[PDB]
RNA sequence: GUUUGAAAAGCACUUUGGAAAGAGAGUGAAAUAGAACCUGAAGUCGUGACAAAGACAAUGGAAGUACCUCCAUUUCAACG
RNA sequence: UAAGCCCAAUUAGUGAUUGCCCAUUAUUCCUUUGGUAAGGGCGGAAACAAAGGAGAAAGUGUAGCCCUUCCGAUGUAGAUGUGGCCUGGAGGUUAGGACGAAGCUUAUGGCGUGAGCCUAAGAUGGACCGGCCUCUAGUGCAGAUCUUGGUUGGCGUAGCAAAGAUCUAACGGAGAUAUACUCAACAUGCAACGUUGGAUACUGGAGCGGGGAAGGAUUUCGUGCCAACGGCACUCGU
RNA sequence: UAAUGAGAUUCCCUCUGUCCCGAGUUACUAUCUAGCGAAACGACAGUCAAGGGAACGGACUUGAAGGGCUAAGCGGGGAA
RNA sequence: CACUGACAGGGAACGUGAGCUGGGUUUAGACCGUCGUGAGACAGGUUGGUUUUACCCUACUUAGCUGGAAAUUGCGAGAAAAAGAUUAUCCGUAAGCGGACGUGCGAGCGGUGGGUGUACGGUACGCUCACC
């Protein structure tokens, strides 16, 4: 009940989805929106390069006083980061989507990532202890990621 | 209510904005006023800063308490390889300003000149000035050279030439740049027909620093200040530091303004960029235009001091190396660190005061070490204090053993 | 503003003839500064494209010392907190006139910005304006009908050179060189101007006489 | 409120993952009824497609226009 | 040679009127609404099929009984009127619903001055409910430092800075040494976990030593195990 | 009134960064990244000069500015 | 008191406390004097007496990125410009006047090719490919 969009040709498109990821929403937002037009192998290349800290993830919406870096001129930004926990959870999802392409009978080297959508999951409640006897919230904010990818060849 | 006591305000307010220089090099924002009764001559020259030292000279100043007595003056050494002319621009007066008519080029440009057009020269096609080189000697391009040379003679009031520092004769290991520094030098003197003939004659020919300046004159030094990062208000503006028992801090300006005008003013001192600023610094008296070591093995030798020694100190200029080329030696300091390109420009101040007409003869140039305390003037003097040491008596033992 | 390659290829795909819009060029020698500015501020706002020329020759009534002080009282104004955000004090006669027009426009709407960018306001007569048609004049603002001739007046090029405006002598050598050039062009064609009028007197009696006493009834002989 | 459904028929099995899960299949009228599971609001958010737009903070009124419209109504021939 | 001051004109010694620009004013023309409102018509005149038309109620108030005429119209606090609107239930009547009721949704128009009502479409819902006349009341929200639940900007921000400190190799572990080609490796899998060995430190016998009271009451121990917790982490754990 | 005083005061000696007049170094922060992640506050918002006004305007009148979006500061305003 | 050329007078919410300081006013403790029957009073003296928050908007200071003249669009055409502005080679001035490759083969101004010395190390100057 979850996919906002459906593929054109569903017999040439493999889906993948995360139930409740427990990464930060505001970092898996930009980790995942950067691969929304990329092929599967160029999107996987980007994530192995964010881990090596050779390329960065551009923070374009939930940036808000992050440090500005020299590597965000690739994306036309000034500030971006290397969110390694949102990166490696998106690598588990690209590996699920290409396993779901092989059992459909499809070549995973021809898959363009159509449709990345990240939405907010239900938050999880903890507690921090402030001065003067106060107790105030310490929420988690996890996320929902979904993607298909449609084959574009010849 | 008025301020209870008066001090003069902190910092000159005319050097605002105290932001980083747009470019690392010294650039003249104004050349001297063109006297058309003079002979055509260049007006600026780029030199690179190579440490500093001090001299001894006797003073001709009648009336003074130091008349015919020897002073010690600090001097700065500025290495000057010759610059090669590659272009001629010409500017025409408009009610908007001063518009460029065009530029002729030299028919032969250096590798390090057309290196300035590349962020990456070695990994490139390197084909800049390659279609201008071949069009310039076609039939139509020899016309178009003479077409815009005539348009200088019609419309131009200001003729300038384009030179570049020629860094491969600067055999310096620490100035790491290999592309040449490019500026425009204004011709002053004569009419426009007499300026272009001097601009045509020294084209694709190197101009040497002693053809622009004389030995005992002054000059302006357009140069970019040594940079110091973000500094607070006490380092940058020189405000007074607050009493010791102040909460949240000392090195601050206490009041940044009244209730009304309900805004902070541009006159209130704040923190930010200190250093790396362009400065012009007029009336820098020149003391010695030096000559290259291939010509002069005895550079710091005076009439009154016959020690055979060069300008480079013992153990080199600290952080720089060796002065391998021609050099100018100026009285005092110039803005900037060592290795930085600086523009010696002819003065706009009246050079008629009796301090500035004074001819300079030296008596001593300090060639002692700038590492540590300088003690010996040459290495011949350290081999006479210290005799044969241990490492010399075992090198003399290998030389007998052969 | 030179036209881009998108604006240049479309003038080659479509074979665009060289176009000039209907531009009225006023010669403002010996005009009242604010009477000419109000005629111009109404015409620009009625959709006229207006080039204004010779702004160093505009006149303001009163002693030159009087009008120079009124500019220096205007230059006394600046935003004390940050003068880079302050009133910007333009010293050119061509820019004094653009301001005086602009202060008579609805400056803070788009209709008054479309009318202030319809004004150009050169000073002297530039080479692109010279041979583009006869200059016009504003005869209700011309100082010989608007100022009493015993009263002093003030040339705007002289008030402005002593408050700034470092290009007074440049304009004076660009307009000395024009009137020398345009008077050499006018001694030429004097045997072309006299050639036509000795052919328009010769066209009479070579044309039929029943079209001449209708050409003499309406006084066109 | 446990009120999933008429009935657990409460998703066998396949292959990706260490797993949570995912992609298919299957049950059922319905699975966008999949387990504190009928309906699923407002606020808030993501995404696809578009409309644009300087700095007059925005909203607002009047009067036109430009483009759009799973909307209404009327008209189609010796007739509106 | 005012676009200033004081006088004066109205297109100028030409022959007579009122230069023209702007109102929620004035005059007048429409429409609405209310009157201390004012008049008229309401005994169906005759006649008329399909293949000139419909209405006409003796009336406070309506989708007003129908026409004609005249005057007024803003307003806080306040009073009043309303065949004025809306919600829950009750008495009666008249009807809807598995061919889809309530609810929800809206670039769904329609019409009412308005409160509101009604239609359409849901690729929504899945069993109840509308209209009119009366009766009744826990009957209408935008604000009470309003109550309760949720959400949001701030914001991936402030911060997670006392108690010195960790390093190494081998094993364990899913936690790696993770790459579409025409690529030797660096420049495309980073970080992080436990155990033993080794190195380096620390506590320094008023001890991050070994036992008791009070207090706690299974935290003890082994084995599995990682959802949530141990504000970072965990394969470890009170 | 001797002795005693974390009592109140004054001078002198020694002494020194209290000061003239500041400079330079260290550890920890700030700062940048990985993981984690709040609060106060919040009508709407936020450039000024003068005028008027409930007689100190971010909004009204007439002028003067203002391309958009950012990172680190900072304490003049927001009668914070 | 002393130096100085001189030690002018004021404003900015009696400028300026999330700038500081806290001496003083301006609490609770205590002492004294005068007052009051008392509790207490005192523009009387004395002593001791928590100075909290910026990470928001603007302003100012510096530090980045980046469009746009219909100030995002219109295709809405304005050059501080050349002079066929009616066809078309330049040079130099208006009257004049200098020359301009000729027909796949040639030539000319030229960019790069092989061997024995010149100007202030290595770049230029002597003697196969494009264009006219
Ligand atoms: N997008 C604009 C907004 O639409 C909202 O309302 C929208 C939704 O509430 C509404 O819901 C749609 C419905 O149209 C559509 N025909 C079917 C769909 N099931 C509904 O969507 C609903 O269900 C899905 C999952 O089933 C949820 O994820 C979703 O949050 C929920 N809105 O569609 C409405 C638009 O037609 C708000 N009323 C309004 O504030 C605003 O206009
Ligand atoms: Mg440095
Ligand atoms: Mg009322
Ligand atoms: Mg109630
Ligand atoms: Mg820390
Ligand atoms: Mg120890
Ligand atoms: Mg934890
Ligand atoms: Mg005691």
Spatial distance between the Cα atoms of B61 and B131, rounded to a whole number of angstroms? 60
Contact B227, B18 (CB under 8 A): no
How remote is the CA of residue A34 from the centroid of ligand 6, in Å?
54
Contact A138, A121 (CB under 8 A): no
Q: How far is CA A55 from the centre of its chain?
A: 15
- Do B and A touch, 3+ Cβ pairs within 8 Å? The answer is no
Spatial distance between the Cα atoms of B135 and B149, rounded to a whole number of angstroms? 16
How remote is the CA of residue A127 from the centroid of ligand 5, in Å?
21
Verify if strand D has an atom below 7 Å from the CB of A45.
Answer: no
Indicate the DSSP class of residue C47.
T
Spatial distance between the Cα atoms of A25 and A38, rounded to a whole number of angstroms? 21
- Cα-flanking dihedrals φ and ψ of residue A52, to 5°? -75, -5
Nearest to C93 by CA among C180, C26, C2, C162: C162
Nearest to A111 by CA among A85, A150, A63: A150
Q: Within 10 Å of residue C138's Cβ, how many Cβ atoms?
A: 17
> Is B261 close to C80, i.e. CB distance below 8 A?
yes
Verify if strand G has an atom below 7 Å from the CB of C201.
Answer: no
Q: How many angstroms separate the Cα of B249 from the Cα of each of B241, B267, B319?
A: 9, 22, 37
Contact B328, B71 (CB under 8 A): no
Could you tell me the resolution of this structure in angstroms? 2.5
Spatial distance between the Cα atoms of B18 and B187, rounded to a whole number of angstroms? 32
Q: How many angstroms separate the Cα of C28 from the Cα of each of C18, C40, C58, C101?
A: 28, 11, 6, 13
Nearest to C93 by CA among C58, C138, C48, C130: C58
How remote is the CA of residue A83 from the centroid of ligand 1, in Å?
33
Residues of chain C contacting residue B93, judged by C-beta atoms under 8 Å apart: 170
Sequence-separated (6 or more) residues with CB below 8 Å from residue A23: A85, A86, A89, A142, A143
Residues of chain B contacting residue C128, judged by C-beta atoms under 8 Å apart: none
Sign of CA dihedral B321, B322, B324, B325: positive
Contact C154, C64 (CB under 8 A): yes
- Cα-flanking dihedrals φ and ψ of residue B161, to 5°? -120, 155
> Is C170 close to B95, i.e. CB distance below 8 A?
yes
Indicate the DSSP class of residue A40.
H
Nearest to C118 by CA among C190, C181, C43, C62: C43
Q: Within 10 Å of residue A51's Cβ, how many Cβ atoms?
A: 14
Spatial distance between the Cα atoms of B280 and A117, rounded to a whole number of angstroms? 58
Verify if strand F has an atom below 7 Å from the CB of A84.
Answer: yes
Spatial distance between the Cα atoms of C126 and C137, rounded to a whole number of angstroms? 17
Q: Could you tell me whether strands B364-365 and B230-231 are parallel, antiparallel, or unpaired per DSSP bridges? A: unpaired
How remote is the CA of residue B276 from the centroid of ligand 2, in Å?
9
Break positions in chain C: residue before each gap, C to N over 2.5 angstroms: none
Spatial distance between the Cα atoms of C114 and C108, rounded to a whole number of angstroms? 11
Q: Environment class of residue A11 by beta-carbon count within 10 Å: exposed (0-12), middle (13-18) or buried (19+)? A: exposed
Q: How far is CA C186 from the centre of its chain?
A: 21
> Is B261 close to C171, i.e. CB distance below 8 A?
no
- Cα-flanking dihedrals φ and ψ of residue C9, to 5°? -75, -30
DSSP B227-276: P--EE-HHHHT-PPPPPTT-SS-SSS-S----SSS-S--TTS---EE-S-
SS3 at position A52: coil
Sign of CA dihedral B261, B262, B264, B268: positive
Residues of chain B contacting residue C123, judged by C-beta atoms under 8 Å apart: 95
Work out the angle at residue B82's Cα, subtended by the Cα atoms of residues B195 and B107, and round it to the nearest 5 degrees. Answer: 60
Sign of CA dihedral A70, A75, A78, A79: negative
Verify if strand F has an atom below 7 Å from the CB of A117.
Answer: no
Spatial distance between the Cα atoms of B308 and B310, rounded to a whole number of angstroms? 7
Residue with nearest Cα to nucleotide G11 C1': B1
Q: How far is the CA of B131 from the C1' of G129 (A)?
A: 14
Sign of CA dihedral B112, B114, B118, B119: positive
Q: Does B390 touch chain C (CB under 8 A)?
A: no
Indicate the DSSP class of residue A67.
P
Spatial distance between the Cα atoms of B21 and B225, rounded to a whole number of angstroms? 9
Work out the angle at residue B258's Cα, subtended by the Cα atoms of residues B252 and B260, and round it to the nearest 5 degrees. Answer: 145
Q: Does B266 touch chain C (CB under 8 A)?
A: yes
How remote is the CA of residue A26 from the centroid of ligand 7, in Å?
19
Taking the C1' atom of every nucleotide in all shown strands and the CA of B276, the nearest one is G62
How remote is the CA of residue A104 from the centroid of ligand 6, in Å?
67
Spatial distance between the Cα atoms of B135 and B113, rounded to a whole number of angstroms? 19
Verify if strand F has an atom below 7 Å from the CB of A137.
Answer: yes
Count Cβ neighbours within 10 Å for each residue of B18-28 and write b for 16 or more, e otherwise: bebbeebbbbb
Contact A68, A130 (CB under 8 A): no
Q: Within 10 Å of residue B223's Cβ, how many Cβ atoms?
A: 28
Q: Could you tell me whether strands B83-93 and B70-79 are parallel, antiparallel, or unpaired per DSSP bridges? A: unpaired
Chain D positions under 7 Å from a protein CB?
15-17, 19-24, 31-32, 34, 45-48, 54-55
Q: How many angstroms separate the Cα of B134 from the Cα of each of A65, B131, B150?
A: 54, 5, 21
> Is B95 close to C80, i.e. CB distance below 8 A?
no
Taking the C1' atom of every nucleotide in all shown strands and the CA of A69, the nearest one is F32
Q: Does B261 touch chain C (CB under 8 A)?
A: yes
Q: Does B95 touch chain C (CB under 8 A)?
A: yes
Spatial distance between the Cα atoms of B326 and B344, rounded to a whole number of angstroms? 14
Verify if strand D has an atom below 7 Å from the CB of A42.
Answer: no
Q: Environment class of residue C115 by beta-carbon count within 10 Å: exposed (0-12), middle (13-18) or buried (19+)? A: buried
Nearest to C64 by CA among C134, C188, C153, C167: C153
Spatial distance between the Cα atoms of B333 and B340, rounded to a whole number of angstroms? 13
Q: How far is CA B238 from the centre of its chain?
A: 27
- Nearest chain C CA: its distance from B272 CA (Å): 17
Spatial distance between the Cα atoms of B344 and B27, rounded to a whole number of angstroms? 10
Contact B45, B289 (CB under 8 A): no
Nearest to A151 by CA among A97, A89, A85, A107: A107
Q: Which two tokens stand for residue B396?
A: 């003399």
Mutate to test the interface with B, among C53, C54, C81, C94 (most CBs of B within 10 A): C81
Q: How far is CA B394 from the centre of its chain?
A: 46
Q: Environment class of residue A38 by beta-carbon count within 10 Å: exposed (0-12), middle (13-18) or buried (19+)? A: middle
Q: Which two tokens stand for residue C122?
A: 């050169």
If you search the block for the tokens 């020189």, which residue do you land on? B238
Sequence-separated (6 or more) residues with CB below 8 Å from residue C220: none
SS3 at position B215: coil
Spatial distance between the Cα atoms of A4 and A117, rounded to a whole number of angstroms? 8
How remote is the CA of residue B275 from the centroid of ligand 2, in Å?
10
Chain G positions under 7 Å from a protein CB?
9-16, 18-22, 52, 56, 59-66, 69-71, 75, 77-83, 85, 90-92, 94, 101, 108-112, 120, 122-125, 131-132
Residues of chain C contacting residue B95, judged by C-beta atoms under 8 Å apart: 92, 94, 123-124, 167, 170-171, 174
Sequence-separated (6 or more) residues with CB below 8 Å from residue B24: B224, B340, B341
Nearest to B185 by CA among B251, B116, B87, B323: B87
Technique used to solve these coordinates = cryo-EM
If you search the block for the tokens 């003097």, which residue do you land on? B381
Mutate to test the interface with B, among C86, C95, C127, C170 (most CBs of B within 10 A): C170
Indicate the helix (H) or strand (E) that contains B104: strand B98-105
- Nearest chain C CA: its distance from B263 CA (Å): 7
């Amino acid at each position: 009940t979850h996919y906002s969009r459906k593929p054109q040709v569903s017999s040439k498109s493999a889906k993948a989805k995360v139930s409740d990821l427990r990464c930060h929403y505001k970092n898996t937002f930009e980790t995942a929106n950067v691969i929304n037009g990329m092929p599967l192998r160029k999107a996987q290349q980007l994530y192995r390069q964010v881990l090596a800290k050779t390329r960065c993830i551009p923070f374009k919406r939930y940036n808000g006083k992050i440090g500005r870096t020299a590597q965000a001129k690739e994306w036309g930004q000034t500030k971006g980061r290397w969110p390694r926990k949102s990166v490696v959870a998106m690598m588990s999802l690209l590996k699920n989507a290409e396993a779901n392409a092989i059992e459909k009978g499809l070549d995973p080297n021809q898959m363009v990532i159509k449709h990345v959508q990240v939405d907010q999951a239900a938050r999880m409640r903890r507690r921090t202890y402030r001065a003067h006897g106060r107790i105030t919230p310490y929420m988690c904010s996890p996320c929902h990621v979904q993607l298909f990818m449609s084959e574009k060849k010849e | 209510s008025h301020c209870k006591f008066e001090h003069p305000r902190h910092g000159h307010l005319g050097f605002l904005p105290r932001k980083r220089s747009r470019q690392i090099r010294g650039r003249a924002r104004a050349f001297p006023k063109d006297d058309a009764t003079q002979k055509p001559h260049l007006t600026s020259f780029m030199v690179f800063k190579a440490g500093m030292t001090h001299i001894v000279r006797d003073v001709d100043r009648p009336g003074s308490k130091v008349n015919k007595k020897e002073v010690v003056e600090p001097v700065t050494i500025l290495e000057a390889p010759p610059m090669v002319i590659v272009g001629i621009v010409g500017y025409r007066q408009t009610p908007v300003g001063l518009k460029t008519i065009g530029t002729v080029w030299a028919h032969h440009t250096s590798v390090e000149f057309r290196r300035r057009y590349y962020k990456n020269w070695k990994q490139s096609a390197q084909l800049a000035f390659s279609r201008q080189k071949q069009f310039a000697n076609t039939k139509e391009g020899k016309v178009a050279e003479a077409r815009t040379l005539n348009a200088f003679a019609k419309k131009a009031s200001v003729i300038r030439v384009i030179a570049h520092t020629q860094l491969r004769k600067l055999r310096n290991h620490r100035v790491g740049v290999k592309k040449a520094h490019v500026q425009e030098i204004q011709i002053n003197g004569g009419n426009v027909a007499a300026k272009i003939a001097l601009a045509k004659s020294l084209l694709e020919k190197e101009v040497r620093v002693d053809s622009v300046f004389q030995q005992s004159e002054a000059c302006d030094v357009c140069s970019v200040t040594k940079g110091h990062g973000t500094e607070g208000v006490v380092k940058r503006w020189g405000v007074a530091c607050l009493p010791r028992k102040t909460h949240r801090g000392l090195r601050k300006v206490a009041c940044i303004g009244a209730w009304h005008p309900a805004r902070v003013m541009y006159t209130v001192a704040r923190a930010g960029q200190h250093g790396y600023h362009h400065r012009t610094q007029l009336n820098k008296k020149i003391y010695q235009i030096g000559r290259s070591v291939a010509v002069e093995p005895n550079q710091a030798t005076t009439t009154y001091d016959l020690t055979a020694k060069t300008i480079t100190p013992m153990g080199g200029f600290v952080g720089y190396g060796t002065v391998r080329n021609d050099y100018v030696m100026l009285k005092g300091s110039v803005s900037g660190p060592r290795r930085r390109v600086m523009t010696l420009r002819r003065p706009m101040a009246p050079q008629t005061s009796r301090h500035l007409k004074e001819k300079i003869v030296l008596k001593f140039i300090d060639t002692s070490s700038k590492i540590g305390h300088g003690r010996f003037q040459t290495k011949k003097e350290k081999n006479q204090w210290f005799g044969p040491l241990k490492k010399d008596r075992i090198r003399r033992e290998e030389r007998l053993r052969k | 503003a030179f036209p881009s390659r998108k604006d240049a290829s479309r003038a080659q795909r479509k074979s665009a003839k060289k176009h000039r819009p209907e531009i009225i060029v006023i010669d403002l020698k010996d005009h009242v500064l604010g009477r000419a500015a109000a005629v111009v501020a109404k015409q620009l706002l009625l959709g006229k494209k207006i080039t204004v020329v010779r702004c160093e020759q505009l006149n303001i009534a009163g002693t030159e010392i009087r009008n120079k002080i009124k500019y220096l009282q205007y230059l006394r104004k600046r935003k004390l907190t940050n003068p880079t955000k302050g009133p910007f004090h333009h010293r050119a006669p061509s820019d004094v006139f653009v301001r005086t027009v602009r202060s008579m426009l609805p400056r803070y709407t788009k209709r008054g910005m479309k009318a202030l960018n319809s004004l150009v306001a050169y000073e002297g007569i530039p080479p692109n304006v010279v041979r583009t048609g006869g200059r016009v004049v504003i005869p209700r603002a011309q100082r010989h009908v608007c100022y009493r001739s015993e009263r002093p007046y003030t040339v705007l090029g002289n008030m402005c050179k002593h408050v700034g405006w470092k290009y007074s002598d440049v304009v004076a050598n660009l307009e000395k060189a024009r009137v020398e050039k345009a008077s050499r062009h006018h001694e030429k064609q004097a045997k072309l101007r006299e050639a036509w009028k000795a052919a328009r007197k010769e066209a009479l009696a070579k044309m039929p006489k029943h079209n001449v006493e209708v050409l003499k009834k309406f006084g066109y002989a």
